[PDB]
Amino acid sequence: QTCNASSPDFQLCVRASLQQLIPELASGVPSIGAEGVDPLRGLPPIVHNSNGFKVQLDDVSISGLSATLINDVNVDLTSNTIRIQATVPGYITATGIQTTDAEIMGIPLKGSGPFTISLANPSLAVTLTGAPSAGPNGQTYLRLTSASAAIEPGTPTADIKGFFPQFPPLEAAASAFASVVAPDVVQSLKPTLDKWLGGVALQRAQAVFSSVSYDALFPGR
Amino acid sequence: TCNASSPDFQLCVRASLQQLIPELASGVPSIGAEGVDPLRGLPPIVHNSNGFKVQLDDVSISGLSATLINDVNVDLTSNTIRIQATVPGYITATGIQTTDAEIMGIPLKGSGPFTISLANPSLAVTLTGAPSAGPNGQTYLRLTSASAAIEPGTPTADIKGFFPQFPPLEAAASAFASVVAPDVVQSLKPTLDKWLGGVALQRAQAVFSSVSYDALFPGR
Ligand SMILES: CC1=C(/C=C/C(C)=C/C=C/C(C)=C/C=C/C=C(C)/C=C/C=C(C)/C=C/C2=C(C)CCCC2(C)C)C(C)(C)CCC1
Numbered sequence: 121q122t123c124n125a126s127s128p129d130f131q132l133c134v135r136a137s138l139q140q141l142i143p144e145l146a147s148g149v150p151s152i153g154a155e156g157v158d159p160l161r162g163l164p165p166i167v168h169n170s171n172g173f174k175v176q177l178d179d180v181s182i183s184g185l186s187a188t189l190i191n192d193v194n195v196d197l198t199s200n201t202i203r204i205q206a207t208v209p210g211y212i213t214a215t216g217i218q219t220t221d222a223e224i225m226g227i228p229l230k231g232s233g234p235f236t237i238s239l240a241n242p243s244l245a246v247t248l249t250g251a252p253s254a255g256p257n258g259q260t261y262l263r264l265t266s267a268s269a270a271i272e273p274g275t276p277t278a279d280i281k282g283f284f285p286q287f288p289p290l291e292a293a294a295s296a297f298a299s300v301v302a303p304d305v306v307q308s309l310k311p312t313l314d315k316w317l318g319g320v321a322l323q324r325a326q327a328v329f330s331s332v333s334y335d336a337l338f339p340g341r
Numbered sequence: 342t343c344n345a346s347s348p349d350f351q352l353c354v355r356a357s358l359q360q361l362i363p364e365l366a367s368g369v370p371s372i373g374a375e376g377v378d379p380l381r382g383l384p385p386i387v388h389n390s391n392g393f394k395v396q397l398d399d400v401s402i403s404g405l406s407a408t409l410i411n412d413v414n415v416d417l418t419s420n421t422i423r424i425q426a427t428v429p430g431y432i433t434a435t436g437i438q439t440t441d442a443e444i445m446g447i448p449l450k451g452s453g454p455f456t457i458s459l460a461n462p463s464l465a466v467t468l469t470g471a472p473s474a475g476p477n478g479q480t481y482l483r484l485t486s487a488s489a490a491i492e493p494g495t496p497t498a499d500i501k502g503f504f505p506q507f508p509p510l511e512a513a514a515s516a517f518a519s520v521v522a523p524d525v526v527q528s529l530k531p532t533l534d535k536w537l538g539g540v541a542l543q544r545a546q547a548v549f550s551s552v553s554y555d556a557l558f559p560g561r
């Protein structure tokens with residue numbers, strides 16, 4: 121349902137439209153240049169480098185995102201700024217390869233191996249900004265320039281391998297330790313994850329906004 | 342008291358010492374001999390080489406009253422006592438470890454109690470001195486040196502103090518210590534040898550202070 125910008129409840133119309141689109145976005149809508157969101161794969165590395173906290177997350181795949189409920193949308197066609205507040209009921213799960221070198225609460229965690237983290241009841245606030253741009257057809261496309269993301273990660277449950285590989289019970293106990301510290305670790309990873317999600321949100325929306333014209337999405341302006 | 346001129350004397354000393362081991366356990370203060378089971382009041386064991394830094398304090402060893410003496414030799418010409426002994430079953434040592442090491446890829450930094458059990462260990466001891474005319478004309482052997490050659494047998498370990506800040510990781514570091522303990526003990530063996538040597542020197546000197554060479558071994 122295209123939302124007429126002149127219509128009295130355009131903001132509400134976009135909310136409803138986007139909600140409808142989430143289940144279809146799961147495997148992806150390749151006609152609109154939108155990659156799959158459940159699973160959300162083919163992502164950049166997550167990189168955090170702080171003193172006593174070096175983490176790289178590679179081959180990141182997130183499942184569970186087609187259950188997303190949209191709290192709010194605002195499309196401000198004066199500034200070309202889309203704000204979305206969304207929540208996932210239940211869980212999302214991320215998989216990939218961790219490479220960590222960290223001192224966490226007195227304990228050394230150096231090594232590399234697979235990860236699984238479940239996040240229970242996460243939310244996100246996203247802001248996207250751009251400017252309209254006349255393409256060589258004369259057709260006007262929105263060229264997005266920035267995204268910021270505010271992840272509320274919720275409750276983490278974690279199974280992390282690769283620590284003390286040289287003795288299996290020590291590996292098993294390091295997996296256990298990782299689960300206990302997971303709330304705190306995720307909480308301190310939040311600004312890294314924020315900037316990362318921002319970048320992904322920028323790139324994946326730009327793919328949509330390249331393919332579908334601003335006048336086709338939002339008639340009457 | 343074994344006679345030096347008696348047909349067999351070397352076997353008499355072996356047998357003498359064998360009889361004495363159970364009595365030595367809590368200690369024989371008439372011959373100036375501290376207890377051997379437990380063997381306590383000992384110096385620190387110290388090792389610092391090759392990124393492997395270990396201090397063992399408050400060391401106490403149990404199980405030593407089951408010691409079998411394989412051989413004794415008392416060489417009155419050089420004043421040299423060589424003993425070969427074995428403990429059937431187990432001796433166990435307890436104390437405080439403070440360690441800072443990388444062992445087989447794993448960091449072990451911390452401090453806590455230790456227990457280490459050795460199954461069927463053995464020892465070769467050599468004690469050397471010279472005769473000394475003591476107060477009122479009895480001859481006492483004044484020992485000057487000792488070496489010890491420990492054969493540690495099969496080590497098993499329960500060691501606390503590593504990753505204290507999460508209990509399962511401490512429990513797994515205790516497990517890891519048991520698996521590496523043969524190797525660790527084998528590389529500690531020169532440190533342990535010099536330490537035991539010192540103890541054996543000090544503890545025998547106390548005995549050889551009190552009981553004269555002529556009383557122990559008549560007719561020489
Ligand atoms: C669908 C969609 C949407 C939405 C979305 C969302 C809502 C998202 C989210 C997202 C999220 C919410 C995310 C998150 C993530 C995270 C992660 C992935 C992380 C990771 C982590 C880890 C892995 C960790 C680890 C560790 C530990 C725990 C311990 C220590 C060690 C270590 C470091 C290893 C929207 C509206 C836009 C529209 C369109 C479509």
Ligand SMILES: CC1=C(/C=C/C(C)=C/C=C/C(C)=C/C=C/C=C(C)/C=C/C=C(C)/C=C/C2=C(C)CCCC2(C)C)C(C)(C)CCC1
Nearest residue numbers: 395405408426434438440455457462464491498518522525
């Ligand atoms: C009775 C007697 C005798 C003998 C004796 C003997 C036979 C002895 C023995 C002894 C011995 C044979 C000893 C041993 C000892 C040892 C030790 C004391 C050890 C220790 C160890 C440890 C404690 C360790 C630890 C650890 C580990 C294991 C791992 C890593 C970490 C650590 C390093 C912590 C005679 C005849 C001379 C006479 C007099 C009396």
